[PDB]
């Protein structure tokens, strides 16, 4: 009764019969912002059921040496539907985010996938001084690629990131996992195109495996924002 | 005695301190005072005054030319008219003003401001005006169609003769900064444009050039932080007769 | 902490918290009705 | 559930348990919660009543300790003809070049504090006649803000700028500054861009710049020179932390960014984190008698 | 005045000083707090969290592969899998833990951990472990039979793909030190060991080889002490633009 | 002792004993009965 | 602020100060108390404690024979047998003595002391003795008809193999000094003698000579005063392994 | 005077005057009536 769930937002639905009790990160649901910690003036934009509502990403390949794949939020959205149309006319946005990741697989398939929300996730290179310039950090709806996930491209640890809001989808056990996220910002509002509060990161722990004839194994990404609201409206940017 | 312990900061001078220090002319009976009109005990009452912007701030503009800003009759429709950068920081049309000045004195800010405008043609000049401020984010717009998208008002000359652009605290955090970096997320406040709405109309005996004065104030939502040396003045040099008081 | 005999050897006093604004930005008798001045 | 927890938790005696049904040894890691077997439920336990504190371990005790935030050694003589700090410094004020304070700091997202900051102050003879007390000033300058470039600039006058005269004779030099972020947090780490072009610098959100901290020596330059060092310390206090964080592993190569390289080899390599076993039945430190 | 003396102590400074000191920016006003989640108050509440035992610690292993223990089908009985120092100070597979990193920082502790571990086979993939604690004094088992007199878990693969091996608080003193010796009687936490119980039994079709991913916690009976610079961060250099703050 | 006028300026603020650790080790909105969790 | 004026001892550490100092360790929680046996609160405690003197403390005496008085028969009537000088500053029976060695951290004592003396014979041997405290003032007994004039117990060695001989605080000033001086007037407390009351008499199958070993503690209406460093023990040199605490 | 957060930083506790000597003088459990012991 942990195992199956639907969850609908505006227009969409998805149904899972093989969840793991959904992550609610650091026990916070994503609200819209009140009067005593809200900034900016002007009556907000709430379009609630055009905006938020799930918004299924390019899945990508899971094969022997992947090595993962990270989306940056709300970057990977600013682009998608009534979403990103108000994120282009707006100086501000808030919003929290459901995200719904699917893989499934054969009952001979192995392979375990940490699926983990890292607030912040301010990217090092590799073996330089430069910074990371802004094509490598802001990649879009396609996300990016883990150069090493071992350190999660900023010289900490996998092995530690079980301290930020994560799920597994382990395929014996499961094939999705669920993760709500807050508004989790040091301001109120902030503007779409220059800051990423969230990343997403799906990270190959157990390889992929079976000796079965081989299938190709999508991973897939459904992100939900939840409680969008928009503020200082103008013209698009694009 | 006391047993006692001295502390890092013992003898330091800080030059913000709040201490009682020692009085030097004992029983000293200061003047009693007097009701002097015009008070001011917090600085954001003089910000809250409108002053007069320099949006004129141009080569072949001398002196108080640049506090005005001239407008023609024209015959294209739609045109942009003048364009106002809000960054108080650097030099712009919004320093040598009230709230610009004390302002500049602080690092961090925050607030509503508002711009009047008043129109200084002839009685018999007409026009529509649209004033539109634009958050920032993008480049300035340049044309009509692209600026009113953004917060705007449309001014009608008439026997009110002038109007109030509010530009509202539109920003992500509590307080903008007063750095150099004007592109910075965390100073950059957007644009101010004026638009013909309609056109300049003017008698053939009224003058068929009329003027603009632009004022700006903060609202009393306005706030200042973080006190610093304003960067409006300086001297490399002791000044003229410094030296006599010595002698 | 101010052990002086002359009251105005004390610390700074910066709890004066009154403005009047109004002198400065609105120095008519008629309050104007927030409706035209003229 | 919040609740206030002043010592470790006690133990509850346990008897035999043989309970179809119930599994408490038994988890499911995927749904991300932490195990919840308590030892009473996996092995038979005695009563423990437990008195063990737990202050060391509260963020305020683990963060408010005063390190080292800068340390510059700059020539006290006379410059007329050098190319350098010429009796005085500028140092934008940050956290990340020493590396103790800036993995404690490191472990957590967001940050706010206000800041006690000491300035030790040391001298030394160039190569003797006695080391000089000298007075120093050190000016908070806002980040950007117009900073001083001469020792003897007009600019020292600090008229409305916070300074603190200070010797060298004297305990050192303490003010606070306090959380000053325009935010209610400093951005430990910030994914994004401080502009709203596309050169601007990644991971620096300059909201969570203290400032620049001018300090020169006040004094005249004497007939023979000195070098002065000036470390700078801070202690974060009033301390609330947000979003814990994996602790950094590879040595920090930069003060701009988080990029890695590694040692070359393990402990603490790219490839290879813990220092290697020879196999995973191996017992490294293994008791033999 | 007040008769004083000074005390051994004055004017020192004293790193873990706990003292008010002269504010900087008198009337300052610092931002409003707002809510943000996931506060932490106590260093504890982060060791409560599991994260993954790095114990592939092999050359050999490269990265990620050595955060897994593959586990494959056997041919004899009651086979050792894999061991696991329970030393936290020297390196080993604990010390890049929540757990561990966060230990580092002090001297002492006490309390019991937990070693979680999920079984990552296929669905079809079946098998029984013995995972084996045993408290310190001899060498570390070697075999089965000799392990599980100590604290033990037999763990049957299942719907539940994980287990727990508690490591109860085991020790004659209050505290444990994280000391350099790892062989000291106030040191040494013992051996966990794991042992084929069964044996891996799998589909032609599932992988003949599946993987254990080892997590340790501590639980909330877990106290830290004495408070120390961590062994696992150093620098010899300035880092790189540390000197680029000075210009 | 703390005879400043800003709050800011007092000594370190050790007894806030309050913990939550469940936001970090049981973030799921089903508390999961101490029994399978699936 | 505050005026102040330091004074004379500003400044100074006396090593005998009691003043609050700072906690290096902030928030550090020790190890809770257990319930050990045999605490000790009071140094008098201690020299309550009975304990062997040195009597035999001769050439020819080696070790553990210096704890022991040997006492055969006689042919002669009332003789001596040993007689112990109460001189616990300079080297005697009563130095290396519970009460003598924490005495000798002290200056001045006051209070009655307890000799105590087991007679450690056969069962068959018998006899009595005669142990006599002469207070100061002349030179010690020779002589039994002599001695005891003075302070004395007559023992018969029976079931109980011991006796106390009392020496009752005896003294014009309150206390008494441990000056090297050990004939002065503040310092002296006369003599313990012990004279053959009848005679050691045994069989032919018992021991000829037996021992005696003698006791001696303080009353509890003994007290110590004026704390000092004790002459029992002293360096010229670092101990040995001392430096390698420095490597 | 002792201004510090932590109680292990007072000065020295010179106040503890219980004594029990019995617990070295006398550690028997039959008290010797003062009578012989035997």
């Given at each position: 009764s942990d195992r199956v769930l639907q969850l609908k937002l505006g227009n969409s639905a998805i149904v899972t019969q093989e969840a793991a009790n959904y992550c609610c990160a650091y026990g916070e649901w994503p609200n819209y912002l009140p009067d005593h910690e809200a900034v900016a003036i002007d009556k907000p934009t709430q379009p609630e059921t055009a905006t938020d509502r799930f918004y299924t990403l390019k899945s990508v390949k899971w094969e022997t040496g992947s090595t993962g794949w990270w989306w940056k939020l709300p970057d990977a959205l600013n682009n998608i539907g009534m979403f990103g149309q108000n994120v282009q006319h707006h100086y501000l946005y808030r919003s929290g985010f459901l995200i719904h990741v699917q893989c499934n697989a054969t009952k001979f398939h192995q392979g375990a996938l940490l699926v983990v929300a890292i607030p912040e996730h301010q990217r090092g290179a590799h073996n330089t001084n430069t910074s990371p310039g802004f094509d490598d950090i802001m990649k879009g709806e396609e996300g990016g690629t883990f150069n090493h996930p071992y350190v999660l491209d900023d010289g900490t640890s996998l092995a530690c990131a079980t301290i930020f809001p994560h799920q597994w989808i382990n395929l014996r056990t499961n094939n999705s996992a669920t993760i709500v996220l807050p508004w989790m910002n040091a301001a109120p509002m902030d503007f779409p195109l220059r800051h990423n509060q969230w990343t997403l990161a799906i990270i190959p722990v157990v390889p992929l495996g079976t000796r079965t004839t081989s299938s190709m194994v999508p991973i897939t990404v459904s992100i939900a924002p939840m409680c969008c609201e928009f503020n200082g409206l103008r013209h698009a940017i694009t | 005695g006391v047993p006692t312990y001295l502390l890092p900061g013992s003898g330091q001078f800080l030059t913000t301190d709040d201490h009682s220090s020692a009085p030097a002319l004992p029983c000293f009976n200061p003047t009693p005072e007097m009701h002097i009109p015009?008070?001011?005990?917090?600085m954001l009452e003089v910000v809250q005054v409108e002053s007069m912007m320099e949006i004129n701030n141009t080569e072949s503009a001398v002196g108080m030319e640049r506090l005005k800003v001239d407008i023609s009759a024209l015959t294209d429709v739609d045109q942009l008219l003048f364009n106002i950068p809000l960054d108080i920081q650097l030099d712009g049309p919004l320093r040598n003003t009230l709230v610009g000045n004390i302002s500049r004195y602080y690092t961090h800010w925050s607030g509503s401001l508002e711009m009047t405008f008043m129109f200084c043609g002839s009685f018999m000049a007409a026009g529509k005006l649209i004033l539109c401020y634009t958050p920032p984010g993008g480049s300035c717009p340049t044309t009509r169609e692209t600026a009113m998208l953004g917060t705007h008002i449309v001014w009608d000359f008439g026997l009110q003769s002038s109007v109030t652009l509010i530009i509202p605290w539109i920003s992500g955090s509590h307080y903008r900064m007063f750095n150099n970096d004007a592109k910075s997320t965390n100073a950059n406040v957007g644009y101010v444009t004026c638009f013909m709405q309609t056109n300049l109309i003017v008698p053939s005996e009224s003058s068929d050039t009329c003027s603009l004065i632009g004022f700006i104030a903060a609202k009393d939502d306005f706030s200042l932080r973080l006190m610093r040396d304003s960067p409006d003045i300086g001297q490399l040099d002791h000044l003229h007769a410094a030296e006599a008081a010595y002698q | 902490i101010n052990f002086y005999?002359?009251?105005?050897?004390?610390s700074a006093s910066k709890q004066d918290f009154s403005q009047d604004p109004s002198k400065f930005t609105e120095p008519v008798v008629e309050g104007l009705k927030a409706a035209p001045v003229l | 559930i919040e609740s206030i927890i002043k010592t470790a938790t006690d133990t509850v005696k346990s008897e035999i348990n043989a309970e179809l049904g119930v599994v408490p040894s038994l988890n499911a890691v995927e749904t991300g919660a932490t195990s919840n077997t308590e030892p009473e439920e996996a092995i038979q336990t005695r009563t423990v009543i437990n008195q063990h504190?737990?202050?060391?371990?509260l963020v305020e005790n683990f963060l408010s300790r005063a390190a080292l935030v800068s340390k510059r050694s700059f020539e006290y003589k006379d410059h007329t003809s050098s190319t350098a700090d010429k009796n005085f410094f500028k140092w934008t004020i940050n956290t990340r070049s020493f590396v103790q304070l800036r993995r404690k700091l490191e472990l957590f997202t967001y940050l706010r504090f206000d800041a006690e900051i000491t300035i030790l102050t040391t001298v030394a003879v160039n190569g003797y006649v006695g080391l000089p007390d000298l007075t120093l000033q050190a000016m908070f300058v806002p980040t950007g803000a117009l900073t001083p470039?001469?020792?003897?600039?007009?600019?020292?006058?600090?008229?409305?700028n916070a300074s603190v005269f200070f010797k060298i004779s004297d305990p050192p030099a303490r003010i606070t500054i306090p959380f000053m972020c325009i935010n209610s947090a400093y951005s430990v780490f910030y994914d994004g861009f401080a502009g709203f072009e596309k050169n601007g610098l990644y991971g620096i959100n300059p909201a969570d710049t203290i400032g620049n901290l001018c300090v020169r020596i006040v004094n005249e330059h004497q007939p023979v020179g000195f070098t002065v060092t000036v470390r700078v310390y801070m202690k974060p206090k009033h301390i609330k932390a947000w979003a814990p964080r994996p602790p950094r592993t590879l040595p920090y190569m930069s003060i701009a960014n988080a990029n890695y390289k590694g040692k070359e080899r393990a402990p603490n390599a790219l490839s290879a984190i813990i220092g290697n076993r020879d196999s995973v039945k191996t017992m490294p430190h293994n008791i033999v008698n």
């Open positions: - | 015009g008070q001011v005990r917090n | 005999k002359d009251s105005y050897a004390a | 504190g737990v202050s060391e371990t470039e001469k020792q003897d600039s007009f600019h020292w006058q600090s008229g409305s």
